[PDB]
Coordinates of C-alpha atoms in Angstrom, one line a residue:
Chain A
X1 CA -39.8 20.1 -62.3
X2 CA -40.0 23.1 -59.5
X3 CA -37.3 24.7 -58.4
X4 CA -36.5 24.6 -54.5
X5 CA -33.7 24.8 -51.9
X6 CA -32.3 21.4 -53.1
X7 CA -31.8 22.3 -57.4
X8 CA -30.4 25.4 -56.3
X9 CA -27.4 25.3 -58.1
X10 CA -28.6 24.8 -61.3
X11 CA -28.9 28.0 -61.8
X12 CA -25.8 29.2 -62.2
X13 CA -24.6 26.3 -65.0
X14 CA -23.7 26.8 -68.4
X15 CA -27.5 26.1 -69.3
X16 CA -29.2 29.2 -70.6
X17 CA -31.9 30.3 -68.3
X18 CA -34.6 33.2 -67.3
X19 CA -36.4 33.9 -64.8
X20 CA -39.3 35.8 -65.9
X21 CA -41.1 37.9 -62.9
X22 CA -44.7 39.3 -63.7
X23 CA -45.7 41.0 -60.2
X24 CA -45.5 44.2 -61.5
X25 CA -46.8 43.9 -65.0
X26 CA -50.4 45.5 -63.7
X27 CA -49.7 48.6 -61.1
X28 CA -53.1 50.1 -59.9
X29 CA -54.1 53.3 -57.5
X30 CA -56.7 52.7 -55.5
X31 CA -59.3 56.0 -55.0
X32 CA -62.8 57.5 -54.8
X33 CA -64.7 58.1 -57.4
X34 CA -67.0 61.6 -56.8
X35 CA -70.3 59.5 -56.0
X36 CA -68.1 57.7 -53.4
X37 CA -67.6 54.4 -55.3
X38 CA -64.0 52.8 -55.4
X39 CA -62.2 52.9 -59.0
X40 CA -58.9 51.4 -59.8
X41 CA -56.2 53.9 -62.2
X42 CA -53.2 52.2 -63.7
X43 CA -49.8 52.9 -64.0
X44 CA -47.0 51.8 -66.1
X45 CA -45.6 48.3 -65.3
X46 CA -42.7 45.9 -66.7
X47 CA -42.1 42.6 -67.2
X48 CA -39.2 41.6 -65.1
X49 CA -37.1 38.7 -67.3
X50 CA -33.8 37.4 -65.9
X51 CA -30.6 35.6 -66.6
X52 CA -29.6 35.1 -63.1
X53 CA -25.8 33.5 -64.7
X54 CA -24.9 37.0 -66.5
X55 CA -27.3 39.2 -64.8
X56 CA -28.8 40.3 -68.2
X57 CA -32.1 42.4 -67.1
X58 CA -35.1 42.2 -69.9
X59 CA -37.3 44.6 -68.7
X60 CA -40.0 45.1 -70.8
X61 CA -42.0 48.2 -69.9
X62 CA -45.7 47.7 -70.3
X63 CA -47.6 51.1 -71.0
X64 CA -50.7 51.6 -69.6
X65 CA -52.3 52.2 -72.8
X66 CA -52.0 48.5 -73.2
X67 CA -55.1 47.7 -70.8
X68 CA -57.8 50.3 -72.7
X69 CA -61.0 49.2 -73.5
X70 CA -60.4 45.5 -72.1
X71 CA -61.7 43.1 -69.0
X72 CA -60.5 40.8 -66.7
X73 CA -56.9 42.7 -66.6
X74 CA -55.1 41.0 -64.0
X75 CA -56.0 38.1 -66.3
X76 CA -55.0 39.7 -69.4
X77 CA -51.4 40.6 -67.8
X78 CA -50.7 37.3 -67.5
X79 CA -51.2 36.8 -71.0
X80 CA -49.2 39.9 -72.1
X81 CA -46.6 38.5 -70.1
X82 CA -46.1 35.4 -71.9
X83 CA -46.9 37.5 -75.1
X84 CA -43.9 39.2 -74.7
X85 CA -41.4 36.8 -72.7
X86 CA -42.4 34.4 -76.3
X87 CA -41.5 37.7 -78.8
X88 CA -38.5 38.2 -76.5
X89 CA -37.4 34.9 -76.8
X90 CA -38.0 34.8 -80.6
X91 CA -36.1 38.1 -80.9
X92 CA -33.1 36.3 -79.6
X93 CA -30.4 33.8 -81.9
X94 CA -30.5 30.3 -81.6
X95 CA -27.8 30.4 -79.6
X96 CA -29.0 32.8 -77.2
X97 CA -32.7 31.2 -76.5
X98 CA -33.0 30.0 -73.6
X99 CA -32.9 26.2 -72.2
X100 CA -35.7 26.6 -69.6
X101 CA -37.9 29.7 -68.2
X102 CA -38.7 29.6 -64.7
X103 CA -41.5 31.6 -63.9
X104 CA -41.9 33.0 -60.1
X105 CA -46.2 32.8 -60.3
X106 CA -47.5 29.4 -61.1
X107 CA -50.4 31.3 -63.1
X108 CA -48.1 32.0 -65.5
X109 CA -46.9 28.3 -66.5
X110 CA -50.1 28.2 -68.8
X111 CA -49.9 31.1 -70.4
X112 CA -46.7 31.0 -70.9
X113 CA -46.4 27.6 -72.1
X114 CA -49.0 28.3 -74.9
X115 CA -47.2 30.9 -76.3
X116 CA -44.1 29.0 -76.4
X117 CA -45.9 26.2 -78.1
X118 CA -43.3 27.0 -81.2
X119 CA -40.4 26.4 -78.9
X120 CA -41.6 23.0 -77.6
X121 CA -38.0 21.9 -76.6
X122 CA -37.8 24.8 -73.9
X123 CA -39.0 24.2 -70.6
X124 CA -41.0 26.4 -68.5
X125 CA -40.8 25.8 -64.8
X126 CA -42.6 26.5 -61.5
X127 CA -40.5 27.4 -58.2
X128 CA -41.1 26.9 -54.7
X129 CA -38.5 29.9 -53.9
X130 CA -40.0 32.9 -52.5
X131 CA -37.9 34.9 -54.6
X132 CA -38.0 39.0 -53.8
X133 CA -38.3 40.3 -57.6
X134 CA -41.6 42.2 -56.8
X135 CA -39.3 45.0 -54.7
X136 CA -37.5 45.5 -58.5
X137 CA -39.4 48.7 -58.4
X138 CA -37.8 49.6 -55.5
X139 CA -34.6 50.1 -57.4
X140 CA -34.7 53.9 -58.3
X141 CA -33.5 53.6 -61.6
X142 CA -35.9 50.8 -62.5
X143 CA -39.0 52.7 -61.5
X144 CA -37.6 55.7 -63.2
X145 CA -36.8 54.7 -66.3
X146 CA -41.0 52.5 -65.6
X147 CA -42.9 55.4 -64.7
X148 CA -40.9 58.0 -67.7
X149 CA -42.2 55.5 -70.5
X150 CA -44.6 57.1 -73.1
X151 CA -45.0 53.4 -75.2
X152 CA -44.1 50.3 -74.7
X153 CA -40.0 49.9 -74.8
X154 CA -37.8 47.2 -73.6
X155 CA -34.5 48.4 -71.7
X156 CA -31.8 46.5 -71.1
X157 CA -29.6 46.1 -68.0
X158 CA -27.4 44.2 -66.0
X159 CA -28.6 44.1 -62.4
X160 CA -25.0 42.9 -60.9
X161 CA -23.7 46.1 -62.1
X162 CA -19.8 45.0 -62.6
X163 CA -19.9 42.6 -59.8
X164 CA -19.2 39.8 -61.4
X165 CA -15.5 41.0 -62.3
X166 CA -14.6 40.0 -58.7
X167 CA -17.5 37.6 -57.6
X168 CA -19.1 34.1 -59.1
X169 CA -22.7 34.3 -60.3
X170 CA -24.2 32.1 -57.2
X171 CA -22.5 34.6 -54.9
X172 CA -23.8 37.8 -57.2
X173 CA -27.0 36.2 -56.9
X174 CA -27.5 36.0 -53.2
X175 CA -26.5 39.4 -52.8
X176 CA -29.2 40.7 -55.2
X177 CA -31.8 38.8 -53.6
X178 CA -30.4 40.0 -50.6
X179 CA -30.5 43.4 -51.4
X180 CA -34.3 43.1 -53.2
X181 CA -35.4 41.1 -49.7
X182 CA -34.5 44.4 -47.7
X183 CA -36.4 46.3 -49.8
X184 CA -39.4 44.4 -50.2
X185 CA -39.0 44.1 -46.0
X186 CA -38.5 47.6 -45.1
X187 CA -38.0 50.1 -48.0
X188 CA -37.4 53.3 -45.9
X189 CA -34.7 51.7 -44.2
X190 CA -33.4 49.2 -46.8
X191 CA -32.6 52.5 -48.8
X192 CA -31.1 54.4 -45.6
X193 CA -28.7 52.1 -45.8
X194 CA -27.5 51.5 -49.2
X195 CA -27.2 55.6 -49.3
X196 CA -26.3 57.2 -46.4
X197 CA -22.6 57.7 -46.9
X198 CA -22.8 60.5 -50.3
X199 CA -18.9 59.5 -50.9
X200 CA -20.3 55.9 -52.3
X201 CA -22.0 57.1 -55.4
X202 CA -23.9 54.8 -57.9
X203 CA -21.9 55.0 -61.6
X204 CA -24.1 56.1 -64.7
X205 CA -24.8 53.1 -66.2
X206 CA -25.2 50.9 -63.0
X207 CA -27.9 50.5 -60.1
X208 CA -25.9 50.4 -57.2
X209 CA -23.1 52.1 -55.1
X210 CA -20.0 51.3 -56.5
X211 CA -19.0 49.5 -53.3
X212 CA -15.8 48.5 -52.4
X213 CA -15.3 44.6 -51.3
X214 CA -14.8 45.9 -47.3
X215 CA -18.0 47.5 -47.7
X216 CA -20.1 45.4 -49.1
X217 CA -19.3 43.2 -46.3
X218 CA -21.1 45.8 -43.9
X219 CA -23.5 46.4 -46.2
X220 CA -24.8 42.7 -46.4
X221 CA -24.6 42.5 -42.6
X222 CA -26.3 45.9 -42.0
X223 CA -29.5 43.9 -44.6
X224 CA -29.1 40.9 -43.0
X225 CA -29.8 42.5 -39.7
X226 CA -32.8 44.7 -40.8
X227 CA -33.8 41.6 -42.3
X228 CA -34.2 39.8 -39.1
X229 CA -35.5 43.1 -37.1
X230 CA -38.8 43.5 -39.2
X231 CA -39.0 39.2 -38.8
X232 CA -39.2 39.8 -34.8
X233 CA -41.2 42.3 -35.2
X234 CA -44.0 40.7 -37.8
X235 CA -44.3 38.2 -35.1
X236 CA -43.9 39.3 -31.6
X237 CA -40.7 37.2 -31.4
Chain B
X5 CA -83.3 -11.3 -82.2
X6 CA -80.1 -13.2 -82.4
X7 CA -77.9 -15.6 -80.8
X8 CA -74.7 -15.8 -79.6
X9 CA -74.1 -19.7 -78.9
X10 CA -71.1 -20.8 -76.6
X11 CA -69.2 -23.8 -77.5
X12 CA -68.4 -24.5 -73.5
X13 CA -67.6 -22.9 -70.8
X14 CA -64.5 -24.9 -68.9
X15 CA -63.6 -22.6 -66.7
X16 CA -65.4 -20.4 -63.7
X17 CA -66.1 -16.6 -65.2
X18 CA -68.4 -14.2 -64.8
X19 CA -70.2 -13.2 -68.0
X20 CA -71.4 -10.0 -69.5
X21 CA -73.3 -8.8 -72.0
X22 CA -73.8 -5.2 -72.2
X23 CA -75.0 -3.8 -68.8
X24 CA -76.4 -7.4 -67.3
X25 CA -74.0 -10.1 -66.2
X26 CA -74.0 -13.9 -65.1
X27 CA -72.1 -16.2 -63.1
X28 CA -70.8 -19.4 -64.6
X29 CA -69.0 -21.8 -63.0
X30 CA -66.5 -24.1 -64.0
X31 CA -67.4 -26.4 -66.8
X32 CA -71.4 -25.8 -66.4
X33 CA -73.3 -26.6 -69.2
X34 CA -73.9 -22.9 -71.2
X35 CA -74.3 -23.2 -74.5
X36 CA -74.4 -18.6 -75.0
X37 CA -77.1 -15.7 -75.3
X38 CA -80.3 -15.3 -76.9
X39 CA -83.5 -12.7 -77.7
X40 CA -80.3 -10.3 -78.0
X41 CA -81.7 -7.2 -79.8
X42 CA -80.5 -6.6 -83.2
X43 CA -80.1 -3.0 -84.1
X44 CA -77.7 -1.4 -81.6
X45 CA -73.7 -2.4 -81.5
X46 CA -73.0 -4.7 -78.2
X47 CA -70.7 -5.9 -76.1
X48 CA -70.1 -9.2 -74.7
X49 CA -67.4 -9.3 -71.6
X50 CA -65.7 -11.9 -69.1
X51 CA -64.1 -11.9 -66.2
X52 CA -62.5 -14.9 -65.0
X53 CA -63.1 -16.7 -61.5
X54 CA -59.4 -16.9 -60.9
X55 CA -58.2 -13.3 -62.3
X56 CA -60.0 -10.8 -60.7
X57 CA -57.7 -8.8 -63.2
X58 CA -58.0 -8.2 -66.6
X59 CA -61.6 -7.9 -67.8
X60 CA -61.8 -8.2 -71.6
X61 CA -64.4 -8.9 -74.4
X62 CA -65.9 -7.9 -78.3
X63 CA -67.7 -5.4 -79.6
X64 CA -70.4 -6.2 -82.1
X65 CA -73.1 -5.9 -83.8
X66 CA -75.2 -9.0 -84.9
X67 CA -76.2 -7.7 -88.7
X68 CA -72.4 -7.8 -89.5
X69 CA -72.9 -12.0 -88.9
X70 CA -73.2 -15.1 -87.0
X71 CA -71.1 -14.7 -84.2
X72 CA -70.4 -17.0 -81.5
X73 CA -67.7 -17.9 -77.9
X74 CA -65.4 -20.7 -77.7
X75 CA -62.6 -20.8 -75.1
X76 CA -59.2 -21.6 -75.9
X77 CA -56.8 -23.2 -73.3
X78 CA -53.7 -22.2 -74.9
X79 CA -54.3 -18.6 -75.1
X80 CA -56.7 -19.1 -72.1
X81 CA -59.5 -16.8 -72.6
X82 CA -63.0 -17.1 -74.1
X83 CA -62.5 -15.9 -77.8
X84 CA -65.1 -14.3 -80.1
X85 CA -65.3 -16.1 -83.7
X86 CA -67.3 -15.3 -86.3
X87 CA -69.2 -18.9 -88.7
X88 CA -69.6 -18.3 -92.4
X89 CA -71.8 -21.6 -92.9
X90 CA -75.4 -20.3 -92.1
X91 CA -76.6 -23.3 -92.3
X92 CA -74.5 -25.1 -89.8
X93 CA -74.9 -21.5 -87.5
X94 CA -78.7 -21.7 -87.4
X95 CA -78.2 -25.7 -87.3
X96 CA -76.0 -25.2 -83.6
X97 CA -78.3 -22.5 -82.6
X98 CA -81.9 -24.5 -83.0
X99 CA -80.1 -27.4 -81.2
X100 CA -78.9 -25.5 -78.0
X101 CA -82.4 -23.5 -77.5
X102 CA -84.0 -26.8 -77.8
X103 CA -82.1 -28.4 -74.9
X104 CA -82.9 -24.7 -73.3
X105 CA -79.3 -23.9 -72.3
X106 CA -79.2 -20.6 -73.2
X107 CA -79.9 -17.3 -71.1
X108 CA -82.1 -15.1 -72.0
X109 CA -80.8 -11.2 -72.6
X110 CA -82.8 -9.8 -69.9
X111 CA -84.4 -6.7 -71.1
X112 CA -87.1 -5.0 -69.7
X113 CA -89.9 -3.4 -72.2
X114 CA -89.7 0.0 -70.5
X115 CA -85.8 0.3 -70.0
X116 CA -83.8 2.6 -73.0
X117 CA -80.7 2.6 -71.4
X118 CA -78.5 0.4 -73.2
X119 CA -79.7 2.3 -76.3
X120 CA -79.4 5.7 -74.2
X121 CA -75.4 4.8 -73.4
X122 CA -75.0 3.5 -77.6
X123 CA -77.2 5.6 -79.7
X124 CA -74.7 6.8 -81.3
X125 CA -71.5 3.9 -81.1
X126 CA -71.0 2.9 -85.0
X127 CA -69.4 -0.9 -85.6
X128 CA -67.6 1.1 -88.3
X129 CA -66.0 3.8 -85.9
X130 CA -65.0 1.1 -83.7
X131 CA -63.4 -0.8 -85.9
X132 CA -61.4 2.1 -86.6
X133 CA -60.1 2.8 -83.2
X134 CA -59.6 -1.1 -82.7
X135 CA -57.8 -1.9 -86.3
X136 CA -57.8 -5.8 -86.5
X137 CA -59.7 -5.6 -90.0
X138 CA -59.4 -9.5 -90.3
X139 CA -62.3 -9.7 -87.8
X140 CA -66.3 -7.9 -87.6
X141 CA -65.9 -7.9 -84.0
X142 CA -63.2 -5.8 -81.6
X143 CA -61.3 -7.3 -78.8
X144 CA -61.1 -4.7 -75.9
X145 CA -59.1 -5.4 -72.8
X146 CA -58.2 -3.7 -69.5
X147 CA -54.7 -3.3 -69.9
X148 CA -55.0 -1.7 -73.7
X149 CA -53.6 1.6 -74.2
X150 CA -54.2 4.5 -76.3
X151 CA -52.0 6.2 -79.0
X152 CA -51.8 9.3 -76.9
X153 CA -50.4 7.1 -74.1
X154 CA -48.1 5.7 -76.6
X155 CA -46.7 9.0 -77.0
X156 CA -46.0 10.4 -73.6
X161 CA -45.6 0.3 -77.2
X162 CA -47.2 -2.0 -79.4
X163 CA -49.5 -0.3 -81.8
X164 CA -51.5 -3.6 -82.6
X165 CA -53.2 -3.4 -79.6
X166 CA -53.2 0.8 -79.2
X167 CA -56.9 2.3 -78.8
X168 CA -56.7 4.8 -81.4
X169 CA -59.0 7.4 -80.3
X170 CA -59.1 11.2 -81.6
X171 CA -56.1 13.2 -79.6
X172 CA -57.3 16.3 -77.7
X173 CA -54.9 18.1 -76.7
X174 CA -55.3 21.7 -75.3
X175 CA -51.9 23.1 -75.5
X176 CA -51.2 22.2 -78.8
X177 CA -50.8 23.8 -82.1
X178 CA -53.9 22.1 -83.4
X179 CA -56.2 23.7 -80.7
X180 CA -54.5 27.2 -80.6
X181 CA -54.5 29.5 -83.4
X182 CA -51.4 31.6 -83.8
X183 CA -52.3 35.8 -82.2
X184 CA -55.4 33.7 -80.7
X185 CA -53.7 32.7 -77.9
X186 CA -55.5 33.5 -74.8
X187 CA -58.6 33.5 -76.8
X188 CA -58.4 30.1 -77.9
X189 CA -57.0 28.6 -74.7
X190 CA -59.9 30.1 -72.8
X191 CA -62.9 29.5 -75.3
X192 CA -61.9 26.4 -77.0
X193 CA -65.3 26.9 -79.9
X194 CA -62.9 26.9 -82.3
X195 CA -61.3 23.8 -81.9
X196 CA -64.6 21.8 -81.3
X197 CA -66.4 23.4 -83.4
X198 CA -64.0 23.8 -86.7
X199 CA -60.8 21.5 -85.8
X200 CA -62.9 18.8 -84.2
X201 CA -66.7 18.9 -85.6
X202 CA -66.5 20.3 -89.1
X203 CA -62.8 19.0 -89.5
X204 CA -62.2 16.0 -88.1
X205 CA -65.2 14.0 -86.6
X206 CA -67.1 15.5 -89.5
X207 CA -70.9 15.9 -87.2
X208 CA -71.7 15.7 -83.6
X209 CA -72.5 12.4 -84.0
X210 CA -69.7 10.9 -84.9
X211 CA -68.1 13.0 -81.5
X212 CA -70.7 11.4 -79.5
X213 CA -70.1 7.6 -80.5
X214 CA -66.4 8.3 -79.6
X215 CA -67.6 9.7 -76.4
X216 CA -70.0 7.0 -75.7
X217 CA -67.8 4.2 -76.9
X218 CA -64.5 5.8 -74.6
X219 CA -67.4 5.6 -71.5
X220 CA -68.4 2.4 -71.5
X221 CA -64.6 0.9 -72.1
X222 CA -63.2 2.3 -68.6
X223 CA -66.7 1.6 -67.2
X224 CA -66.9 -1.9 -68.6
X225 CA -62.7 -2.7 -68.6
X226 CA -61.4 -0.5 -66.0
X227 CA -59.7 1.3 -69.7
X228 CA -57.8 4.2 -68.3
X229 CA -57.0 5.5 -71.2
X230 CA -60.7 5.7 -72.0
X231 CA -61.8 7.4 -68.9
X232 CA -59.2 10.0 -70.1
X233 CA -60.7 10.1 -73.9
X234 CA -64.0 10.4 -72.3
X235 CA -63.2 13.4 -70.4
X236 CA -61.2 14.9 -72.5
X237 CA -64.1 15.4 -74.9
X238 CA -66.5 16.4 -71.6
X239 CA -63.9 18.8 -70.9
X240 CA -63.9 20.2 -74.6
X241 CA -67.1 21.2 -75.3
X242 CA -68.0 22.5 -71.7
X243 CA -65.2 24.9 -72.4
X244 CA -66.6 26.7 -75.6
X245 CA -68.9 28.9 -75.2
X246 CA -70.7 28.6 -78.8
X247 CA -71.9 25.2 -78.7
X248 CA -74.8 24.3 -80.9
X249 CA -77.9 24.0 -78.9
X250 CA -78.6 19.9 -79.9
X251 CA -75.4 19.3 -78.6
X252 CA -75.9 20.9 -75.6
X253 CA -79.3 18.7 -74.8
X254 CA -77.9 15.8 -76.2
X255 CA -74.8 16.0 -74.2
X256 CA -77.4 16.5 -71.4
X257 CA -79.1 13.0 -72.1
X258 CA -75.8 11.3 -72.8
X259 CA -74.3 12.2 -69.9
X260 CA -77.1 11.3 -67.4
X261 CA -77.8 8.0 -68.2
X262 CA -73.6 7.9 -68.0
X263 CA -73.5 8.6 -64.7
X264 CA -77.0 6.8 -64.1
X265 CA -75.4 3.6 -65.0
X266 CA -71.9 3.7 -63.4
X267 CA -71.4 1.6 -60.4
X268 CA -71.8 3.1 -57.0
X269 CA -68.8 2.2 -55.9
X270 CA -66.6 3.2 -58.6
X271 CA -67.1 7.1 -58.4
X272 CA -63.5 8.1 -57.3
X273 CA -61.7 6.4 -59.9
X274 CA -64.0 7.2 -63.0
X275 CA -64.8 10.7 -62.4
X276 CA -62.3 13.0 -62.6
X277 CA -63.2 15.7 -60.1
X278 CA -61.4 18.6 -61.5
X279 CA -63.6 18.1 -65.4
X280 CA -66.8 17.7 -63.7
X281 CA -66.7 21.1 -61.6
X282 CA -65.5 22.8 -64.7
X283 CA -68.6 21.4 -66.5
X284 CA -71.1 22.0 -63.6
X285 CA -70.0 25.1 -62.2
X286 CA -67.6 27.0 -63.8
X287 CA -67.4 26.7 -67.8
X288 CA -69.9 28.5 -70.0
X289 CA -72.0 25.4 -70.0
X290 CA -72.9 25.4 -66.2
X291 CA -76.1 26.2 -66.5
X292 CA -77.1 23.5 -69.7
X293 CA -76.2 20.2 -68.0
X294 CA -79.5 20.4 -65.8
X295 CA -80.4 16.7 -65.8
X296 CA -76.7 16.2 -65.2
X297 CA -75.9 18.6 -62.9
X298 CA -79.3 17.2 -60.8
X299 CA -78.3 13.7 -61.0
X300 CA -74.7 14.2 -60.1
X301 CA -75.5 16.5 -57.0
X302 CA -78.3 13.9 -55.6
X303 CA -75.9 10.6 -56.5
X304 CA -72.1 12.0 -55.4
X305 CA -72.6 15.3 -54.1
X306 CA -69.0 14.8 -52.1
X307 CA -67.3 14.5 -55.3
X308 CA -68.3 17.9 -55.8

């Protein structure tokens, strides 16, 4: 059924698992048109598919030549989503497919679960989390490597870096959400802090500072704290 | 007109026989049913005084022979058997009309409902979705299930109606995805018409025949069938234009004849907005739409 607080765990098992985010799959500007009316431009998206065990990133650009000449977009990008999590899945070995696919939008457990009619033994799942995948884009390489795309490509990372040579997957985990929550909370500032000493520098292939274990410690006190500054101040408390 | 004579009645039950029912009380002298019209399929049902539960009874249709109610205290329910001796049928009838202890089916000259809610319920279709091929008649009950039921135990008793299913292979064509899920035309109208139900009206006696089970039973499992094809059709947008006025009719006199009291377990809520007010069809249910907004408009 959904996941919550309480199935938690499950997660980081030996069951193969995505989480597949589609929040930014359809990117719009907003602007005037020259008789005044209100028109919408897009920009490149990506599919956001996640093995939150391994931290294996499937992100699977989505070009804005996808959406010409069609309707009822923010509908259709549902569709593509499942479209492409279904030929992603398919692409994969037996042995690699995975066991369930949690989506983070319950308007996607349709469309997915219709595309996956051929894998009928794969469950697709609601959650109740309130996960922070939407401030992916946040991540500078991510939106780079986003807004470069000239076609549709699928680019594969691992968004724990090399974490995982020192920490378990639950604990890798938590800090990325962590680390996405800041972002999506307070960008300007989220960012301040993961850069503002240059002698931390972020290795080719990875997304993050290479930060020893003392400073991560800081670091995931320094979000915490911001975290809880922009909660008091949503809410006058 | 025929008959359908009663051997006894020992014990208190409420009778029906299609939409009229009677009161009987425990070992009063009722000898059955008379003046019943011969030309639509019927249905003759009984509740007992001491089981508020389980409603049953048979489906028939009086050209297919001489049928007639005896009850049976092992098995403790009235049971439908069918005579082959004419002569001694029409020999039991004459007798019980003359000694007048037979009801008259009550119908009034002006009233087309029962034919309204059957005109298109087959005793062959039936028969197929109630296999006991030994018997002309079919035994329906409250507690019966369907075969789709049986998949997500018994399949003597299983209602076999036509699965619908709209997240299955069968209604989604492969690179039709969204299309298909969406505007389901091609799964009424080539899967389901042309394929499988072969014309409309085949669709509608399953339809009709699914209604009056969970109206006259309580049948679950048929409320779901008989939503389930609702839900179809108002969810293509290429429907032929008959079956969009017949569905009309159908379903008017449908929820013209359901009991007041009944609405919030026989209609589903989330089916009847799509049909009314959100599918493609919204604007072709009129007699529907205008009995169902002046009858329940809280459902809505």
């Amino acid at each position: 059924g959904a996941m919550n607080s309480s199935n938690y765990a499950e997660l980081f098992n030996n069951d193969i698992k995505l989480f597949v985010d589609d929040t930014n799959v359809y990117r719009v500007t907003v602007h005037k048109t020259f008789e005044g009316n209100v028109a919408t431009k897009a920009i490149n998206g990506c599919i956001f598919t996640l093995n939150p065990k391994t931290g294996h990133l499937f992100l699977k650009i989505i070009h804005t030549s996808v959406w010409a000449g069609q309707k009822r977009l923010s509908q259709l990008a549902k569709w593509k989503t499942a479209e492409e999590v279904s030929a992603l899945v398919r692409s994969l070995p037996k042995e690699e497919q995975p066991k369930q696919i949690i989506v983070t939008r319950k308007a996607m457990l349709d469309p997915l679960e219709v595309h996956m009619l051929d894998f009928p033994n794969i469950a697709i799942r609601p959650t109740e989390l309130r996960l922070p995948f939407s401030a992916a884009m946040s991540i500078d390489k991510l939106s780079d490597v986003v807004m470069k795309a000239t076609e549709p490509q699928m680019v594969l990372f691992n968004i724990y870096d090399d974490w995982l040579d020192r920490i378990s997957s639950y604990t890798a985990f938590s800090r990325l959400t962590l680390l996405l929550r800041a972002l999506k909370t307070n960008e300007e500032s989220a960012k301040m802090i993961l850069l503002s000493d240059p002698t931390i520098t972020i290795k080719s292939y990875h997304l993050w500072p290479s930060f020893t274990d003392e400073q991560w410690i800081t670091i995931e006190s320094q979000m915490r704290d911001l975290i809880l500054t922009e909660y008091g101040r949503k809410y006058n408390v | 007109m025929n008959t359908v004579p009663f051997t006894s009645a020992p014990i208190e039950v409420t009778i029906g026989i299609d939409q009229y029912s009677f009161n009987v009380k425990e070992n009063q002298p009722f000898h059955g049913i008379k003046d019943i019209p011969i030309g639509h399929v019927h249905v003759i049902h009984f509740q007992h005084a001491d089981n508020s539960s389980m409603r049953y009874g048979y489906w028939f249709d009086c050209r297919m022979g001489n049928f007639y109610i005896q009850y049976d205290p092992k098995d403790g329910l009235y049971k439908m058997m069918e005579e082959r001796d004419g002569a001694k049928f029409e020999n039991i009838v004459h007798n019980f009309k003359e000694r007048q202890m037979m009801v008259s089916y009550p119908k009034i000259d002006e009233d087309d409902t029962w034919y309204n809610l059957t005109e298109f319920v087959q005793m062959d279709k039936i028969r197929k979705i109630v296999r006991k091929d030994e018997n002309q008649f079919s035994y329906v009950d409250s507690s019966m299930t369907t075969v789709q039921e049986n998949e997500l135990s018994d399949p003597a008793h299983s209602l076999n109606y036509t699965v619908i299913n709209f997240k299955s292979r069968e209604a989604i064509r492969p690179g039709h995805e969204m299309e298909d899920f969406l505007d389901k035309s091609y799964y009424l109208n080539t899967v389901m018409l042309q394929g499988i139900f072969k014309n409309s009206s085949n669709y509608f006696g399953e339809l009709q025949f699914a209604f009056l089970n969970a109206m006259f039973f309580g049948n679950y499992g048929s409320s779901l069938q008989w939503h389930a094809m609702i839900e179809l059709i108002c969810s293509s947008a290429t429907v032929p234009k008959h079956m969009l006025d017949k569905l009309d009719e159908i379903l008017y006199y449908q929820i013209k004849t359901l009991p007041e009291q009944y609405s919030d377990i026989l209609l589903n809520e989330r089916v009847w907005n799509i049909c009314l007010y959100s599918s493609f069809q919204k604007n072709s249910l009129h007699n529907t739409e205008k009995i169902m907004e002046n009858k329940y408009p809280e459902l809505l």
